[PDB]
């Protein structure tokens, strides 16, 4: 949906288009498609093939509904989707 570099931390990822722009393994850079599932440590991407990729060693580029491109290390998205959503709540 309407994701930004700031809220992507808690925002759901399923349904967003994504591109692996970096990785500890060069063979996987270039994988693109829509996120069809997310677990604590993985992202399931549906491209030409269905890929299950680890968040910790990948750099993602997500596309927001308005076309905006968002690049963020996958390590920052580690954690179950429901758990990440708790980060939306701020305690000052």
Swiss-Prot record:
Keyword Nuclease recorded: yes
GO molecular function term, any single one: ribonuclease P activity
Presence of keyword Protein transport: no
Catalytic activity, reaction form: Endonucleolytic cleavage of RNA, removing 5'-extranucleotides from tRNA precursor
Activity's thermal dependence: Optimum temperature is 70 degrees Celsius.
Protein keywords: Cytoplasm, Endonuclease, Hydrolase, Nuclease, tRNA processing
Single biological process term from Gene Ontology: tRNA 5'-leader removal
Cell compartment(s), UniProt: Cytoplasm
One GO cellular component term: cytoplasm
Signal peptide start-end: none
UniProt-listed Enzyme Commission number(s): 3.1.26.5
UniProt-reported outcome of changing residue 87 to A: Fully reconstitutes RNase P activity
Primary localization class, coarse: cytoplasm
Subunit structure: Consists of a catalytic RNA component and at least 5 protein subunits. Forms a heterodimeric subcomplex with Rnp4. Reconstituted enzyme missing individual protein subunits is suboptimally active, showing each subunit contributes to optimization of activity.
Family, similarity comment: Belongs to the eukaryotic/archaeal RNase P protein component 1 family.
Summary of the function given for this chain in its UniProt record: Part of ribonuclease P (RNase P), a protein complex that generates mature tRNA molecules by cleaving their 5'-ends. Binds RNase P RNA.
Protein's UniProt name: Ribonuclease P protein component 1
Naturally occurring in which organism (per UniProt): Pyrococcus horikoshii (strain ATCC 700860 / DSM 12428 / JCM 9974 / NBRC 100139 / OT-3)
Designated gene of the protein: rnp1
Parent-protein residues present: 36 to 127 of 127
């Amino acid at each position: 949906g309407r994701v930004t570099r700031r809220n992507i931390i808690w925002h759901e990822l399923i349904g967003l288009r994504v591109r692996i722009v970096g990785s500890t393994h060069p063979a996987f850079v270039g994988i693109e498609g829509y996120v069809i599932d997310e677990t604590r440590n993985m992202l399931v991407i549906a491209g030409d093939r269905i890929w299950k990729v680890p968040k910790d060693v990948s750099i993602f580029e997500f596309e927001a509904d308005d076309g905006t491109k968002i690049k963020i290390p996958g390590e920052r998205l580690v954690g179950r989707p429901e758990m990440r959503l708790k980060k939306r709540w701020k305690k000052w």
